[PDB]
Structures are given as structure tokens and as C-alpha cells.
């Protein structure tokens, strides 16, 4: 009865993230998950994927002036999960309505016309099962695509198509 | 007391807009303009363009349950401006820091891989001068790309590449 | 839609209400909730709170000439919701812009220098969730104070501070 | 930190409850609901019903030596529900055959020559649906009276006839 029976996650340190200055918290257990895509280039090795997480945060903090990278977690095609703001901190990925009540996970890449590789799909689903196991998400949490709550094409046609079949998907 | 022009704006009732539920006001003169794209299909006839203004508002209100189409104005490839929420109503186009202090205009189409036709651009430039002439915009207003204030590809590489050249543009 | 309903509400007859003469319907689902106070005497027991309901309806019907008590629901410090005009009928609580597009709930008493007990707040928020569940309110409904849409102290300095913190609150 | 639980439950600490020491968990969702009376005093205000819940729980804890008040929830004549051991903790209210399979709720007074007011019955029905809504209760649950499962005069003569008229009430 391991108190934390879930998940390999690449932590901030390891992907060389800038220290976060977000303080605003979510309230566990969290009800909604919104799946996005970064919409840039993908990345398929740990060194490449850790670079990409760095660039993303670089955009949100350097350019856009945010307190941290927007997403709670990002999903690489190396098939690891990168800690974004994580389970406890409100992200900025889906507007002032969905942000304080969800967890935004973003796949790194562009899935308009490309599907994530199986290992990235498993990483993402294992990550959700682990949120439930941890009490961070509700046992009956709901998955939305980004496009379901914000006017956008994110998470891309081929990914949208996939998340829709998921156990917890609810539009 | 001088008012001139200046709308060749196509008014909501003409493009068969559903009636807006929004009540929140911008305060004039408005300092900022944010230029997005719909990421959508483009339209080059006053008939398709009216029909697209519908489909775009239909997305925001029916799908997303918003009070109205998120943009203050939209821009067809027909060379006409489409009235959205207009000059005095807060729009929902660039998040909660920029929505209340800006006008958002969006070009109907996806401009990652096309430039909008020059008449589309003349329409947008003439809008903005109208706004100044009305006292809706500050004479020295500033223009931003959507991707400059929010994480997105909007308004498209090509379109973005154009707006960087505008006199009122600002880093 | 559904056999019986959600949440508990003291019915019109139970608080000895005069029959309604109102017929203007609201349009489901409603986007706005406006929270007032009555600035009248407060009460903390089902007996005294029913009495108070009556006195308010009475002032509205007999002195103001309204078809019924202006509020859709009233709220007692006894922790009970009193049925006003209900989910379906247009109230008179927020003036002619807001009355046709909102549900008006009023806490019975004056909340400038005191707060309503946790039980009143709970009942209020409860009511509201039931509104959504019935499909009388939008799921993305927005709460406003009376002072946000009309110039008035209502709902009273201390209660306004409170509703500011509600999830659905948009000034 | 979000909107309160459905049901408008007066939380433990609001009725000045001694802390629970119970830890046997009920496995959701529960099939049976058992209705009892307390046979103690009865109370018609929030003040007097807080106190009465105190007194019942005191009797259970200090005198009988139980981990907490025996009932999952108590119901006041003030029209409120008082959180006992709640949705997730096995109670002690109907003996060892009935406690591990059910949620016990009890009305606070003697219902032999009296009935609880309509508000008290409203609270309870409301509690039970909020049960389902949470996922604590079977969508398709069965309600049983105390005298049906254990030799007793509980829930009184009058209360007991009433609940037999409830829909969910089983033979
Ligand atoms: C999910 C069934 C109906 C939900 C209606 C809203 C009442 C709240 C129940 C959800 C539980 C919670 O918010 O903790």
C-alpha cells in the first residue's frame, strides 16, 4: 500500500526550468482535465524533449511575462512527462473559467495532421491514473479538449480524435 | 463636435448575428488593439463571409456557451469588416489581462500559410483609423499580435509578419 | 425535463404567500445571477423567516404594485431558501436591463456591517448548483452583486466582499 | 475552497462536534438507507438543533464509549441536516447486520405522537439525492425504517407511516 503508487515524471530541475513564481493553488481533488498541444515542433529523445520544455516556459515567462510555464504537465514523444506547474498550482492554459478548476496537460508538438506516438499516449493516460491514485483528480474526472473550451484548434485534429474515445472524455 | 464616416462596417443584423448576451463595457478611448486570426476557413464573398461570421459566432456561443462572438470585429477576405461586439463591449479574444483594455480584431481564415489579400488589410487599417476618428481608440494606440499576449500561432506567421511593420505596432 | 427536482426550498404556500399575478417568462437557460440584500429586518428561525418573506412580498405587492415579490428566491439566516417568483418567471430586482436576463436572489436583512451565517451562504450556493442541474441556469453562469449592475449599496458591503470570492463571480 | 457540498449540510465543527475517532470506511456506493428517530428531545431552531446534535453525540461518546455519534446524518426540525459520521464512515445505528451496508439518518425527536415538519422531510430527501450526486449512494437505493430491521419503536408511529409513502421505501 505504497502512499505514492504512480508515475515517472521528469522534474523541473531536471529539464532545467526556471524557478516558478506562481502562488495560486487548485483545490484537490480536481474535476477537469484539458488536453492541449503546444502547436510547435515535437521532440523525441529526453535531451530534445527537455530542451522543448525549456523553450515553452521561455515563451510563457520571457515573452508573455507569466509566473511560470502555463501547463500543469507536458507530454513528450520521448514518452516521458515533464512537470509543468503540477497538481497543486493553477495553470494558464484554458482561460479564466477553466484554469482555476482543471489540470492542463499539453503534448509537445502539433497534432493537426500527426498522432502522438503510443508511448506518449500511455505516458498521458498513466499520468491521469496517477492523479486519481494520488487524490489530485476526482475518481470521475472529465477530459476536455482545449477546443472544447477555448476557441482554438488545439490539441489538433488527430489528437482531438483520440482523446474523444478515452474513458473520461466528456464534451 | 465633428463625426466623420466611418463605418463601411457590415452590421450584426445584416450578417444574421444571433443576439448578443454580453453586457460588460470597455471604456473609451481604448489603448490597445490585438490582432488574431480565426485559424479558420477564409471567405471572399460578402455572402460566404456573412455565413462565416455566423459559423464563427455559432462556435463561440453554441459550442462554448459564450455571450457572443468573442471578437469586437472580424475581417473577411471580401474587403469588408463584420461587426462583432463593436467598439464599446468587452470582447473575449485575448484573455483577462488584455480583453478589458483592448479591441480584438480577427481575420477570417488561417494565415500560417497565406497572406490575407490587400483589401482585407485595407479594411483592417481603415477600421482602426475609424476608431480613432470616433474617439473609440487612442490616437496613439498600440497593436499586438495574438501570439504576443497569449500563447498561440495566431495570427499566423504571414499575417504576423505583416502587422510587425505597422506604424502602431508595439513589441 | 425531470421528475421532482434538486435542493430544498420552502414553497410559496408554506411561507403563506399571496398568489402570484406575474406571467412574463424567463428564457432557459439563464446566464446571470444577481445577489441583493433586502436591507430589511433579519431572522434566524423558520417561523420568523417565513414571516419576513411575507412582509417583503407584501411591501412589493401592496406598496410597489408588483405582480409578486420581486425576488426569484430569498435567503434566510435560518439556512433556508424561500421560493420567490421561481426559476421560470422574470423578477423585479435589478431594473429593466437585468430583470429579463437574470435570476435575482436576495438575502433577507442588511449586510453592510454584518455577514450572513455560513448556512445562508451554503443554501445560496446550493440553490445555484440546483439551478444548473435543472437547466434553469447555464453551467457557465455568472454571479453579480446588485451594485455591479445598478447603483446601490445592495447587497451590503460585507456580503459583496463574500460573493466576490465565489467561483462564478464576474464583476 | 470551492462551493459547499450539495445538501446544505451543517458541517461537524459548526455544531461544535467532538472530533471523530472512527476509521471503518463504508465502501461506496451504499445500497441501504435506514431511517430512525433519536427518541431524544426535538428542536426547531439552528441554535437549538446544533445543541441537540451535540447532546446526542455526547451521549454516544462519553456514555456509550463510541468513536463518534452513531448516525451518518441527523435531521433537525429547523429543516437542516447535521453531519454525523458522513458519507464515508461506517455508522452504528441499526446493528451489525445493518451498519456495514447502509447510511443511517436520524430525525431528532420522538415521532410517536408527532410528525417532523415538511422542511425536515425535504432536507432528508434532498440529502439522499445529494447522496447519489456525490456517488455515496446507490442511484437505485432502498430506504428502510428502523422498526423494520431491529426491534424498536423508532422512527416513531407518525414518522414511520410517512416514510412508507416515500418512493424509495422498501418492504
Ligand atoms: C454528478 C451528479 C449531479 C451533480 C450536481 C451538483 C451537486 C454536487 C455534487 C458533485 C460533488 C461535489 O461537488 O463535490
Curated annotation (Swiss-Prot), chains A, B, C, D:
Domain N-acetylmuramoyl-L-alanine amidase: 28-156
Biological processes, Gene Ontology terms: defense response to Gram-positive bacterium; detection of bacterium; innate immune response; negative regulation of cytokine production; peptidoglycan catabolic process
Subcellular location(s) per record: Secreted; Cytoplasmic granule
GO cellular component: extracellular region
One Pfam entry name: Amidase_2
Keywords: Antibiotic, Antimicrobial, Disulfide bond, Immunity, Innate immunity, Secreted, Signal
SMART domains on file: Ami_2 (SM00644), PGRP (SM00701)
Keyword Secreted: yes
GO molecular function: N-acetylmuramoyl-L-alanine amidase activity; peptidoglycan binding; peptidoglycan immune receptor activity; zinc ion binding
Cystine bridges: 6-130, 22-67, 43-49
Primary role: Innate immunity protein that plays several important functions in antimicrobial and antitumor defense systems. Acts as a pattern receptor that binds to murein peptidoglycans (PGN) of Gram-positive bacteria and thus provides bactericidal activity. Forms an equimolar complex with heat shock protein HSPA1A and induces programmed cell death through apoptosis and necroptosis in tumor cell lines by activating the TNFR1 receptor on the target cell membrane. In addition, acts in complex with the Ca(2+)-binding protein S100A4 as a chemoattractant able to induce lymphocyte movement.
Family, per entry: Belongs to the N-acetylmuramoyl-L-alanine amidase 2 family.
Subunit structure: Homotetramer.
Name the UniProt record assigns to this protein: Peptidoglycan recognition protein 1
Protein species of origin: Camelus dromedarius
Gene name for this UniProt entry: PGLYRP1
